[PDB]
Amino acid sequence: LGAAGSTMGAASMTLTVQARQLLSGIVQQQNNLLRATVWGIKQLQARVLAVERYLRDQQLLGIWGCSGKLICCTAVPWNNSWSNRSLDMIWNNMTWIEWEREIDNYTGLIYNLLEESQNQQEKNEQELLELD
Amino acid sequence: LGAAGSTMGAASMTLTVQARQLLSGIVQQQNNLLRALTVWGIKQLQARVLAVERYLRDQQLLGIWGCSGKLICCTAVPWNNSWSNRSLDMIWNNMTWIEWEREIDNYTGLIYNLLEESQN
Amino acid sequence: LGAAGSTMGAASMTLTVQARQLLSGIVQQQNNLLRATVWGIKQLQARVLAVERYLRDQQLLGIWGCSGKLICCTAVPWNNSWSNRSLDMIWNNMTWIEWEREIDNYTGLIYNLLEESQNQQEK
Amino acid sequence: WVTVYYGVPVWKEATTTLFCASDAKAYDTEVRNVWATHCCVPTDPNPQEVVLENVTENFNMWKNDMVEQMHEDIISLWDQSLKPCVKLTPLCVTLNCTDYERGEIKNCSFNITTSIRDKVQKEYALFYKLDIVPINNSYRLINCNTSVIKQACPKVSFEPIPIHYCAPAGFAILKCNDKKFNGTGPCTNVSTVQCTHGIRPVVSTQLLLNGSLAEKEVVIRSQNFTNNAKVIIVQLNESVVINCTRPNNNTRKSIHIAPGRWFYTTGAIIGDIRQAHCNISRVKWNNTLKQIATKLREQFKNKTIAFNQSSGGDPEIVMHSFNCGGEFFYCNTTQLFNSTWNDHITLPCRIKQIINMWQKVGKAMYAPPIRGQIRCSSNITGLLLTRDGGSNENKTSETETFRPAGGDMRDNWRSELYKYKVVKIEPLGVAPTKCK
Amino acid sequence: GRWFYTTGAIIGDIRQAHCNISRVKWNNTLKQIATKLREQFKNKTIAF
Amino acid sequence: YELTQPPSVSVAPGKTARITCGGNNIGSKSVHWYQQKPGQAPVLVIYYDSDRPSGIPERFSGSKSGNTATLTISRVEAGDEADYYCQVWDSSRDHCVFGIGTKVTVL
Amino acid sequence: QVQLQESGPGLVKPSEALSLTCSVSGVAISRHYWNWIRQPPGKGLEWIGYIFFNGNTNYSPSLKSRVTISVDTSKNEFSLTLRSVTAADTAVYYCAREKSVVEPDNMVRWFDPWGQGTLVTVSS
Ligand SMILES: *[C@@H]1O[C@H](CO)[C@@H](O[C@@H]2O[C@H](CO)[C@@H](O[C@@H]3O[C@H](CO[C@H]4O[C@H](CO[C@H]5O[C@H](CO)[C@@H](O)[C@H](O)[C@@H]5O)[C@@H](O)[C@H](O[C@H]5O[C@H](CO)[C@@H](O)[C@H](O)[C@@H]5O)[C@@H]4O)[C@@H](O)[C@H](O[C@H]4O[C@H](CO)[C@@H](O)[C@H](O)[C@@H]4O)[C@@H]3O)[C@H](O)[C@H]2NC(C)=O)[C@H](O)[C@H]1NC(C)=O
Ligand SMILES: *[C@@H]1O[C@H](CO)[C@@H](O[C@@H]2O[C@H](CO)[C@@H](O[C@@H]3O[C@H](CO[C@H]4O[C@H](CO[C@H]5O[C@H](CO)[C@@H](O)[C@H](O)[C@@H]5O)[C@@H](O)[C@H](O[C@H]5O[C@H](CO)[C@@H](O)[C@H](O)[C@@H]5O)[C@@H]4O)[C@@H](O)[C@H](O[C@H]4O[C@H](CO)[C@@H](O)[C@H](O)[C@@H]4O)[C@@H]3O)[C@H](O)[C@H]2NC(C)=O)[C@H](O)[C@H]1NC(C)=O
Ligand SMILES: *[C@@H]1O[C@H](CO)[C@@H](O[C@@H]2O[C@H](CO)[C@@H](O)[C@H](O)[C@H]2NC(C)=O)[C@H](O)[C@H]1NC(C)=O
Ligand SMILES: *[C@@H]1O[C@H](CO)[C@@H](O)[C@H](O)[C@H]1NC(C)=O
Ligand SMILES: *[C@@H]1O[C@H](CO)[C@@H](O)[C@H](O)[C@H]1NC(C)=O
Ligand SMILES: *[C@@H]1O[C@H](CO)[C@@H](O)[C@H](O)[C@H]1NC(C)=O
Ligand SMILES: *[C@@H]1O[C@H](CO)[C@@H](O)[C@H](O)[C@H]1NC(C)=O
Ligand SMILES: *[C@@H]1O[C@H](CO)[C@@H](O)[C@H](O)[C@H]1NC(C)=O
Ligand SMILES: *[C@@H]1O[C@H](CO)[C@@H](O)[C@H](O)[C@H]1NC(C)=O
Ligand SMILES: *[C@@H]1O[C@H](CO)[C@@H](O)[C@H](O)[C@H]1NC(C)=O
Ligand SMILES: *[C@@H]1O[C@H](CO)[C@@H](O)[C@H](O)[C@H]1NC(C)=O
């Protein structure tokens, strides 16, 4: 399932294979277990929520160009005002949970920049390249 | 769903944003988190199921066209001026884009399959 | 959507065209919009499950590294313990129905092996 | 440079809907089980927990949403279960009662609201006095002035089979396995589980009747000890066995009350009438209190501990209400608490059939009698105590009193959910890197 | 279980219910009518 | 995977030393550097491709280009004598690769 | 931040297994990857292998037929065993704490605090 007491660097060394277990868990296995208005409508609502959450994450990876990717690098630079720490403190002293909390306040900014650049400015550039 | 430039956003300026595509499949999650009585409950659940179904249908169509990974997708289909035409400057500088619906819904309505079936 | 009794080779030839119809949507275009208290709850259950099936197939293929494709060549070797038949006979004597039944008890294993071998691709 | 990662092991506190997973099979068909099997998920074969090395989390027994969800499923199911059963409204008429401790059991002459022919017919039934209002010798049933009283259906069994609560995918339950956790604050030794252990949905007040035990010693937990108005939940590390009986051989009769429906009551008593007593060993009870008082004194340093008596004018709060075979025993606990500590036991009980369960209004369940005699037993595993308050003596008299009182069933559920928290998984995150 | 809630007695004298409005001059409504008066049977005296 | 590195280089005191390595796709894979004093465990001098960790003098800096990589030490001191190593991680094998170590002498 | 402490048998015979243990007095074993590095006298550095407490382990190909690594998080220590250790395996065996940054296809790792190493002599 995971660890998360580990630092970002260590935890992520296995992201390639830890991911695709968490992903799998969202859709597979539980739905075989469940093949059986108290425990009626509630289960239907739970199924709907799981689907909605799943699609949200896939849509964002898609909008940011990380289609089928677990790790993806894009053209947006890091703004040093956010977590103005050395690269090592971020990757080797802090854990993923601590990290997400520190930059929770910049999530909207990061996501907006990712959308403006990746697959947006980038695709207008591709339409121009394909004109010939 | 800011829709800045929904009318006369040149047409080409609308395309520098395309930021309203992250609402129909996402804001519903936020609405459900805020909520977290069948008289209202069934209808609201039906609305949620439909919003998902509509989202997926558009994704399936983009998949068939070979456009699922793109926000902007150029396909190998010539535009047919017998349906509708004007100069490209008018098209790209003055957005409405409704004049095309009767004809396009049949032209591209069919081509999405023809194109992929005969692509190579 | 016939040729069910045809051999695997014959049925998979041009699998893509047959597949586009099967995959035009589970419900094609929302039951081609033709269809657009207990009766209601039973139908919501049916619709939700159709959505889950669609997504599960896409997710599993994505995990295996097969996306935007119908036919994918993977990193898992065939184990003769699953089946030890000539490549030619399974493809030109057997049908897909017969084949799927023949190796039905190895489905969980093969799928699990594919997830592990396909996930271990650096990424 | 911004790098986006998917599958990042980060979670946030969350509230969601949990699934009911039953314990193996109790799929009886003569009488269906209600708390278990009814619309429940098959057991997920024992998965293992995952310990998260060095992950510490903040757990809180109070304001724990899992307690609230258990509460809502219990109340909702209780009502859904009773809903499709016969109304006893036609029985809300004047009774003429003659009796047969004295008038413990009332022998009442009844005028039937006619069920079929719309012409008068008469019958009789025995009742316990606790269900009757002495409103010239005119008697009425107690809850007819509030709402519809419904008879529980004979095909439904309210047997408290343990239920496992399971997270929907994308969610997880964290469990606190730290030693002597007192229900609040940070916990180490945190693991992630798929489902909770089974919790037996026992409904009781003034005494816990079944459940888990403290690991090494009696553990006393409260939201705040200083505030006397908080409930102190005491979990024992040793089980004390309680034996309850109703040694009265009852003959059941069925009275027609509506087309398609019958009312069940007691027609006659065979042999002499006896009290429905409960028995607790003297030795185990005193040793249990000694241990509680010792730990309680550590919390309330240098004072003598008294437990005194339960108090209030409402039997639902004052007495425990042990559910034995489906009948409800309201028991006198004075003999268990009226003592102090400074360095068998028989309890009389009464039987009541019309109950506004959960101490609510607008409804009541009628428990039909059980044929013959009954016996049951259970493991107490814990007490609910409150503090008496302050005084003008400024505690120079010590004698701090911890009364045997509860009155809110969410505490029973809370006592076994203190170990669990619900979180949601958020797989996306970003970090600075040095690439494209 | 069915209780009817009704009125017992009136204490003190009995009096008619009423609503108060005071010296409202809604002449600006009439002027909007005047604007649309030309459509509503041409220019006419306005009565309520 | 293997790294290419010269056995030695000598420099005059006060001069800048150019200690180098190379190999395939060195541009794609980050190359970090270590300094080993005789009898001591190696100490990281450059992390990632050019980042100097605390405790390492400002005279130490690095750069990556093409199929080669360089450790630059300005104003060399007698105390800089050491064996300097390059290291890369081959992600396709988990093959941790060290260079031979250039013996650097300050005259 | 992290001080590592080596231990070992010193001299071992040419057919015996070598078992070395390093403790960590800095940080928890579960926070970082741990690595073993070999240095024969007169030679440069050779990587042996890495381990993380969750079972993610790997080795340098040159030693794969003879090597295993394990950790014990309850004593906050880790160890290396090399089987059939011969004269050619005389070396200083070092322990180091591994740090990293994760990039899409070029993962970077560093050995930043090092122990001082223990010399293992292999002879008759
Ligand atoms: C409330 O009701 C309960 C019953 O519902 C009643 O329970 C009894 O409580 C007393 C203590 O107060 C228990 O006393 C102990 O008995 C131990 C011996 O019994 C063990 O072995 C039984 C079977 O083998 C023996 O007996 C058979 C005859 O039946 C004989 O042929 C064999 O050769 C052999 O001698 C076994 O049944 C029993 O219980 C287990 O199995 C039953 C199966 O039906 C199951 O229902 C039980 O839950 C349980 O799993 C048990 O395993 C004895 O060893 C023990 O000694 C210790 O304590 C004394 C204290 O003085 C020390 O001196 C001594 O050194 C030891 O430390 C002790 O004497 C009794 O067993 C209970 N009986 C039952 C049936 O559960 C409560 O008392 C009632 N309470 C009140 C307040 O009313
Ligand atoms: C239906 O019932 C309502 C009552 O429920 C009744 O309402 C009154 O209507 C009259 C007529 O329009 C109002 O009279 C006007 O008051 C203007 C001044 O308003 C300010 O001062 C008020 C009084 O101040 C005293 O009390 C305060 C208490 O806190 C104290 O500090 C002051 O020092 C002083 O002693 C004050 O009540 C009022 O408060 C407003 O906000 C509260 C918020 O809770 C709200 O409850 C109040 O209702 C009110 O909105 C405010 O601070 C005054 O300037 C004005 O005179 C000019 O205009 C008239 C226009 O005709 C000219 O002729 C005149 O020459 C001036 O140019 C006038 O005197 C009165 O204030 C209303 N409210 C009350 C409580 O009496 C309706 O009339 C009834 N209708 C019918 C059809 O019956
Ligand atoms: C509650 O009481 C029951 C007895 O009715 C206990 O059940 C027995 O427990 C022992 C272990 O101590 C088992 O060997 C027996 O097989 C069990 N018997 C039955 C009928 O289940 C039960 O353990 C008690 N619960 C607690 C928490 O003490
Ligand atoms: C767990 O983490 C805390 C973080 O402050 C640390 O103090 C503690 O020593 C760690 N426990 C172990 C033994 O890893
Ligand atoms: C109850 O009272 C009736 C008379 O009203 C009598 O006939 C009947 O026998 C009594 N029931 C019992 C159990 O004594
Ligand atoms: C009950 O009956 C007795 C005996 O006839 C009578 O004295 C008493 O007043 C009656 N009850 C009431 C409420 O009047
Ligand atoms: C940590 O939790 C595991 C699982 O509950 C347990 O086996 C282990 O003994 C615990 N260690 C402690 C109490 O620190
Ligand atoms: C419960 O704790 C007390 C602490 O004084 C101990 O003496 C007793 O033996 C424990 N009970 C059990 C069943 O272990
Ligand atoms: C529970 O223990 C913690 C320390 O671990 C303490 O801060 C908290 O106040 C205690 N709870 C109560 C009700 O006193
Ligand atoms: C318990 O019995 C005593 C007997 O003296 C009595 O005074 C007390 O009121 C009874 N308690 C309850 C709850 O009935
Ligand atoms: C309980 O309180 C009463 C006063 O209300 C007192 O008379 C009695 O002795 C007390 N019981 C104990 C055990 O202290």
PDB file of C-alpha atoms and ligand atoms in Angstrom, chain D residues 136-139, ligand 6:
ATOM      1  CA  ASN D 136     -62.452   4.405  37.308  1.00  0.00           C
ATOM      2  CA  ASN D 137     -59.745   1.608  37.037  1.00  0.00           C
ATOM      3  CA  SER D 138     -58.828   2.717  33.466  1.00  0.00           C
ATOM      4  CA  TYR D 139     -55.561   1.681  31.939  1.00  0.00           C
TER       5      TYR D 139
HETATM    6  C1  LIG H   6     -59.617   0.788  41.650  1.00  0.00           C
HETATM    7  O1  LIG H   6     -60.542  -0.155  42.308  1.00  0.00           O
HETATM    8  C2  LIG H   6     -60.696   0.089  43.776  1.00  0.00           C
HETATM    9  C3  LIG H   6     -61.625  -1.002  44.322  1.00  0.00           C
HETATM   10  O2  LIG H   6     -62.946  -0.937  43.785  1.00  0.00           O
HETATM   11  C4  LIG H   6     -61.235   1.543  44.032  1.00  0.00           C
HETATM   12  O3  LIG H   6     -61.300   1.787  45.440  1.00  0.00           O
HETATM   13  C5  LIG H   6     -60.264   2.589  43.363  1.00  0.00           C
HETATM   14  O4  LIG H   6     -60.781   3.909  43.625  1.00  0.00           O
HETATM   15  C6  LIG H   6     -60.166   2.284  41.810  1.00  0.00           C
HETATM   16  N1  LIG H   6     -59.242   3.161  41.031  1.00  0.00           N
HETATM   17  C7  LIG H   6     -59.498   4.436  40.701  1.00  0.00           C
HETATM   18  C8  LIG H   6     -58.500   5.202  39.880  1.00  0.00           C
HETATM   19  O5  LIG H   6     -60.541   5.008  41.045  1.00  0.00           O
END
